[PDB]
Amino acid sequence: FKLPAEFITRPHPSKDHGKETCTAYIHPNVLSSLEINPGSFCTVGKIGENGILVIARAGDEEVHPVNVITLSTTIRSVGNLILGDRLELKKAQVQPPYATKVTVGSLQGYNILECMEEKVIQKLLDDSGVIMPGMIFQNLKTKAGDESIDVVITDASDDSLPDVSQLDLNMDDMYGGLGSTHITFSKETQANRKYNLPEPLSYAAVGGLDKEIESLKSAIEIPLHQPTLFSSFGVSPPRGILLHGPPGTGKTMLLRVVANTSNAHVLTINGPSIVSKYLGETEAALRDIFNEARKYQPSIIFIDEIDSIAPNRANDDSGEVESRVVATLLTLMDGMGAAGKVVVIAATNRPNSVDPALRRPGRFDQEVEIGIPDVDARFDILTKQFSRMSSDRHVLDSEAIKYIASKTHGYVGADLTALCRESVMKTIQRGLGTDANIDKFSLKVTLKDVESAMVDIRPSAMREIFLEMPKVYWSDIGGQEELKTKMKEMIQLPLEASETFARLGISAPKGVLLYGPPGCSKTLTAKALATESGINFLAVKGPEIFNKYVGESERAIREIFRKARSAAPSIIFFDEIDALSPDRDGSSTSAANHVLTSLLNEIDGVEELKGVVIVAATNRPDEIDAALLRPGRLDRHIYVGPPDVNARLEILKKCTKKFNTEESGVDLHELADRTEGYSGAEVVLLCQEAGLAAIMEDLDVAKVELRHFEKAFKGIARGITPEMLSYYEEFALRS
Amino acid sequence: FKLPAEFITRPHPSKDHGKETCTAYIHPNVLSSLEINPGSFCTVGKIGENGILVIARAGDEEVHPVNVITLSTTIRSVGNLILGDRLELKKAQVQPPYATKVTVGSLQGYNILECMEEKVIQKLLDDSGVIMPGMIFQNLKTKAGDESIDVVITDASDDSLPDVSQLDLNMDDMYGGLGSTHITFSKETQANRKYNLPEPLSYAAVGGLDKEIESLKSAIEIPLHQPTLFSSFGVSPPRGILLHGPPGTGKTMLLRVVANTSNAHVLTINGPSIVSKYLGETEAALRDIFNEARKYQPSIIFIDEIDSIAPNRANDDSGEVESRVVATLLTLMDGMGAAGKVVVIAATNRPNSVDPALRRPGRFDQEVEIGIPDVDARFDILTKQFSRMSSDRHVLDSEAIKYIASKTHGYVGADLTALCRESVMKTIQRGLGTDANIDKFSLKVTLKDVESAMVDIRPSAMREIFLEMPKVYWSDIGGQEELKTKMKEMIQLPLEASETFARLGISAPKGVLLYGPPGCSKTLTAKALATESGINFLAVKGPEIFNKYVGESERAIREIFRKARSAAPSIIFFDEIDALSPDRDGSSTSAANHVLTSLLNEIDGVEELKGVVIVAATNRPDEIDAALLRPGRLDRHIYVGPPDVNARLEILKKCTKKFNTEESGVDLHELADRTEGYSGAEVVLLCQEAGLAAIMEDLDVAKVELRHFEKAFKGIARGITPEMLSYYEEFALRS
Ligand SMILES: Nc1ncnc2c1ncn2[C@@H]1O[C@H](COP(=O)(O)OP(=O)(O)OP(=O)(O)O)[C@@H](O)[C@H]1O
Ligand SMILES: Nc1ncnc2c1ncn2[C@@H]1O[C@H](COP(=O)(O)OP(=O)(O)OP(=O)(O)O)[C@@H](O)[C@H]1O
């Protein structure tokens, strides 16, 4: 009449040896309810993963609750079982026929033990059960030397009739006291790929994320493993940790890693599955999971897609499962325990869509920010992936890895794995369709498939409000020497003399204004500074922040200011301020005035932010209001006129990188002399036109001829007039 | 067949001794239904944390109904049980093994009893129970010296095998009349933090709320304790109290403290959780709650999230749970009784979001308003927090507290608590990473972690209507003596001649206006006046009142005017009046005209605000309409022009305070003489630019040289033209 539905796993206590494989503590009523003899094998469905881990069963001592079951740490780790997964029990399969080879693998060790062995076979196969796909055991105490040693038993040779049961349980035979089947120590094989066993996630897979993953590790370590330190204080420890960022950054993998590396109980909600038609069913499920987490002292709560289950209260009054659930859960967690050891993780894609009641400092104080990987992080990810896929299947060199990382500017970490997979597909196709099913070992991995993959991937990460570490070197930029020297001076003053300024009480100007021709040297300078300084860079587009709704731009400005404040000292750059600054001449609406007063208040109004640096670039400097155009804020002004010969030569070389300079025969000096009064955008347009003319001659071309460049120069005009130069000169004279 | 659903606690009547620990006046039918011996222990589920206050059971005299149960005031105080809490009976647990040490704590006392103790052990352990966490007993009557003494039994070393029992009750075995176990009279420590017992809240915990908390105390004391006070005049006592203010200020603490300190029944609704699919079920529960509250004379009603459950009728006509619940609750509260003794507390985040039908003189006339804490209140809050934290874990001198309070101009109590929490987190992680898990007591809490915490706290309360300025004294202010006696006269007339105005009929003109070139220190003088005068101030900006929603600006203006009226005679200053005033020169929406008409009607129409003083400053006189430029309303005009020679000399002192004048070699008056066409803001800009030049010339210096000041003067223009000064003089002449 008990009718058990689901079970919860639990590690075997008391340590020592005991049984350690077939504990399977089950209430006698449940033992009789399954119509299977207790002193025999048992099966744990765990709603999937067929094979069902055939293991022997044993009785309890009347102190084991029905809802829990012990499947031993070894089996829990081998089967990729995490504390909190739903477990189901049913009848057992046929008895194991026999074992053929059973050979160790010597995980994370150099092997060659011999003396250190001391008959591992006895301590390994003496246990009842011991399923042959995988055993891992603690070092215990072997001879003199202590240390930690572990072995794995992947490799198999026997054949089992039931294809559904891939776990192929085998029996153990012995002859002795205190000889296997033709030894067991051989080779240092890794996890076998034949059975496709689930390899537990580890921190080694994630690379380039070190600082914030370490911070999260500490912030999860200090509540749970050492609660007495806080219990001495007793100041309401934090329970919620924010994990948000762009999609594809790998938050799910981080959650899996922190769940696997910790033996404590965790909760994995399915999201909308908890939502039910009944009014009180959701509350019953919430209180059930909460009291389950409270009953077992070490517990962790994982919540994903908060914006879906718990949307914003004001944004949408959908009803049913709504902010009432938020209120109930907050009230429950606000008094569930004084100190305890409980961790709640809120992993959401966009905190803005989340109810701002969730984003309260009192409860959800801890916040972790995840951004798109930079060049170093991308290189680390690629190297880790190459190490994981092993050198026997590829022939690559590290310089190609830097080249690939540099070629990927806006690529996300999720894009790299797909790029590798599609490169594998391209290599497989290029081998098959060409050589008629030749051996794939020789072809391995090359660079042409990777190049084709990055050409045809077409990522959807181009549109974004924040780009992280643009890549442009000083051998690619174009500008005048005085501007470069000045920018170096005012980037080296604050970051190297903040303490000196604090001692003198003068701080930093925190304002730079740029104005010049629309060609170049006004926008690419920000990217050059971002690449050189290695500091966080914020780019804001004028028309982008404009919205039909009035007041949205104010919220965007507040959000970007908060991001700049919370994202360490950085530099803030605006692409075009001339599209929002004019509020009188342009007869703009109240939104422009609100934006102007907001930026005026944020720059030097009743608040001072020494760490951040504000730099702006504009095309026409006159329409900016005098309130913003005041010395003290953006006081520094640079004339920065049209690019000179070497800068134009440099941008021509940059545009000629795809082509070959020596094949064309151009010395880069005649073209620079001919193109002197033009602009950088005009130079790019001329290069594009010359390339089009070259490729329309005889289809694909390996080089561009000088006649095409001459035709492009003649046909296309600069479009610039001395009037704008005189206007800039007279504006600079009055300033 | 009775099927008891839930039970509510009640203090043990008749005083005396009786049981006083194990009264347990439950109906015998419930005892028989649970299949447990009446002379055995009992437990209350109270939703979660099973094992609360294992206490022996007994029977009643068939008079007390099933719903109400009694567990005595001692157990009520021990378990922090709120009156009328929902309790679910559970089966008993096996008898306690033994008591190990037993030692008193001497709550709220200096201990050292000895002579007047007179063997409290016999009376302490003669009663059944004596639980490990503690007991609370009244002083009763022992010898002479009256007064009140209480003892708690916090510290003990009893071991219990099951971790489910959170209260681990112990048995009683002592020898006495009318040899122990290692005595019990020792130490005077507080509640043990190892067992993390829930300490009830106290009025001393909340700081900086003295006036409003005393008003709330009086408002909740008038109806209940002495209903005759209000029933003598026979005008019916109020039943509802409105609590409102910024989120996370004091509401939950007020509710919890008034619930704990009052022996009356306390009931808190679950808000939207009560709402179900059945329309009539919630309303039937509402009559059930009202009948339960009316049945017992001492009762407290707590209402939360009023806006969520009772929105504005006109704002949203959704359906289902709607104004019908408002009408039924209004009818229930209108005719519950004639005099009675019942207080209803309504804590809402937004008063305007609440349905105005609720805000009625006959129902919810009483309102409690709590603003954002000022410097003094925040300092008191921080000092109370450090007092609670105690000096055994950290050291903090008073000046650091004052500096932190001054820095945290806009922080809220929740923000301060979160900042302290993540300060402790940062200290713990820093110590761990720097010393490999060293003792945290030696490192404790310093100012560096606090500074890092306030840098990375990411404040969210900056966008607030109420703002507090930095405090500046007249010595810090450099200004001319001209008009100083005038402004002293205007500030001293309403405040120090209210009776003279009332008798003579002169009243308050309430008209002060400021004008002149930007940087003429009008805002600085207003801030200095507000700081020195020691009077309440309301910070109003130009665009701040301008709201995107139609009518929101009018509501904000009405709210700020009501706050000024109810916050004693004060001063209201507009930072930028040159935005709301212009309605004819430029194209403006009808909202600006409505605001102008409303302010014109408020300043002098129909009503006169004698107590408060209206002062404003403008950047251009043409923007002010002729309607406001009339005698009686802003008739007084203060020139407050550019600073004089002596004023600029005094200004130069403040900017040079960080530097040292002696080694500079300048006389500090010749530089001021050379700078006569500038303004105070312009002088500050010149000093800042000179400091920037000094730090950019040779980095670290201890002084600014004459050459730097000369270069700053040469490179910066005054930016002021005589024509605008002439226009200002002409405008002043005509008015
Ligand atoms: N830092 C990384 N290193 C390696 N692979 C990564 C990284 N970030 C993402 N990936 C790749 O992206 C995929 C994992 O994406 P995952 O779903 O975990 O991302 P997420 O940002 O948490 O988003 P989602 O909301 O879809 O869960 C895998 O293919 C994985 O290889
Ligand atoms: N004056 C204060 N001193 C110390 N801590 C405070 C103070 N005010 C608020 N807090 C902190 O903020 C938390 C919540 O604040 P508070 O209880 O005052 O909010 P509330 O307005 O009643 O709640 P809600 O956000 O639900 O309306 C407290 O538990 C405490 O940690």
Ligand SMILES: Nc1ncnc2c1ncn2[C@@H]1O[C@H](COP(=O)(O)OP(=O)(O)O)[C@@H](O)[C@H]1O
């Ligand atoms: N002599 C001075 N020393 C220091 N600060 C000054 C001085 N004069 C003006 N200020 C600062 O400049 C501000 C003056 O504001 P103001 O420009 O008059 O406002 P508005 O733009 O409405 O005219 C004040 O907030 C004050 O802090």
